[PDB]
Amino acid sequence: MGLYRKYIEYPVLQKILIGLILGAIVGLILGHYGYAHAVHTYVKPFGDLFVRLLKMLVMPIVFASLVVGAASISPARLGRVGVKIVVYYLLTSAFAVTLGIIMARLFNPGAGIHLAVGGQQFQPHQAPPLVHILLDIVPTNPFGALANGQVLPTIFFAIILGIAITYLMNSENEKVRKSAETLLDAINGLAEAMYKIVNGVMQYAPIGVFALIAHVMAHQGVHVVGELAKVTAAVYVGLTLQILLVYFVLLKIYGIDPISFIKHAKDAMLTAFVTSSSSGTLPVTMRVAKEMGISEGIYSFTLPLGATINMDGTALYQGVATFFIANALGSHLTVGQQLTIVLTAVLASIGTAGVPGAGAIMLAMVLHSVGLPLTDPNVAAAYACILGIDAILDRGRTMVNVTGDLTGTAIVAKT
Ligand SMILES: N[C@@H](CC(=O)O)C(=O)O
Ligand code: NA
Ligand code: NA
Ligand code: NA
């Protein structure tokens, strides 16, 4: 087990990029000499196992995290400035998703791939009338939603359970109060346990990323590499313009000087960029918070709230991916479908945990709203090719999310 210990003790982020570049070389070299059936039958199953691993823990982590999160939060009317706090992030998320559509049309990623994994192109199914969709949010059986795999009914049932369980903790009866604590602790244990499994799966990602990239290179060929570069470059330039478009303009109109703003915050983004974990990068956020030389009481609630609420960078990733998959599958997005992208993506960005890899887990939830379920083999193939390239894209989107946190707290502080 000498080599096993060395392999584990290494930056997980570095290995994925090492695994990604190695996979690309192997696929093209093999593809030039043929052996298309060789990779399809020998190295493909490693990629499929990684896909099944991610889908395993999506359901248990959605239910447990919401119950713990909803119970902890209590309605305090947000005082006076809090209503100004929550409204700020909601509007900004809409802008980020809206910018994704125009930039995606500018480059048009996913053209000329022609997925035929299932033997035929994906055929959209007509959506049921909106009355049936809304009435299905309420689960007729709370246990049925979990077992059958429905996600929307589970979210509704999880939220109300957390709200109902925080009243018992405040109840005067001792037996009722004690029973509420035990039930909350058991679910909190399940949510914590699901996070340790996330680290275990990420250690298998370099092997999983290697298998997925190699399989795609051999079949599609060198052509598919070009589009993968287009989506790679698109997100960064879209994020780059977004920072100047909305984050800079608020600084200019108000009295805070943007040039000095980044000078004190320069260490903040750089530390987050290296670690690529916005939720875990909290200590530096409070570090710069206490050395701004201003009030701390505003910082008592803004940073914990803005940890999960603000996720502009991931939001652009969610929107661009949703559009990219449609082009690969050959199904054009109508105007009506584009309207539900921003509504779904913005609320989706709210539920993101913040740890790296969370966007991949909840990207599929937006796909269900569009009408592209994961059970479709054609959708699975296109979605799998994104899972390989997530690490390099996740390097940039963390910086935007943390920057929006730091920028947003300062402008309200000026008021
Ligand atoms: N780690 C990303 C989120 C993600 O990777 O899904 C962020 O905090 O911006
Ligand atoms: Na936002
Ligand atoms: Na979030
Ligand atoms: Na954030």
From Swiss-Prot:
Pfam families: SDF (PF00375). Changing residue 397 to A: Strongly decreased affinity for aspartate. Na(+) 1 binds at residues 306, 310, 401, 405. Gene3D superfamilies: Sodium:dicarboxylate symporter (1.10.3860.10). L-aspartate binds at residues 276-278, 314, 355, 394, 401. One of its GO terms (molecular function) is amino acid:sodium symporter activity. Keywords: Amino-acid transport, Cell membrane, Chloride, Membrane, Metal-binding, Sodium, Symport, Transmembrane, Transmembrane helix, Transport. GO terms for cellular component: plasma membrane. It is a multi-pass membrane protein. Changing residue 405 to N: Strongly decreased affinity for aspartate. Residues 261-289, 338-372 dip into the membrane without crossing it. It is found in: Cell membrane. Residues 1-11, 63-80, 161-196, 252-260, 290-297 are cytoplasmic. One of its GO terms (biological process) is protein homotrimerization. Residues 31-41, 104-121, 219-230, 321-337, 373-391 are extracellular. InterPro entries: Na-dicarboxylate_symporter (IPR001991), Na-dicarboxylate_symporter_CS (IPR018107), Na:dicarbo_symporter_sf (IPR036458). Homotrimer. Contains eight transmembrane regions plus two helical hairpins that dip into the membrane. These helical hairpin structures play an important role in the transport process. The first enters the membrane from the cytoplasmic side, the second one from the extracellular side. During the transport cycle, the regions involved in amino acid transport, and especially the helical hairpins, move vertically by about 15-18 Angstroms, alternating between exposure to the aqueous phase and reinsertion in the lipid bilayer. In contrast, regions involved in trimerization do not move. Belongs to the dicarboxylate/amino acid:cation symporter (DAACS) (TC 2.A.23) family. Sodium-dependent, high-affinity amino acid transporter that mediates aspartate uptake. Has only very low glutamate transport activity. Functions as a symporter that transports one amino acid molecule together with two or three Na(+) ions, resulting in electrogenic transport. Na(+) binding enhances the affinity for aspartate. Mediates Cl(-) flux that is not coupled to amino acid transport; this avoids the accumulation of negative charges due to aspartate and Na(+) symport. In contrast to mammalian homologs, transport does not depend on pH or K(+) ions. This is Glutamate transporter homolog.
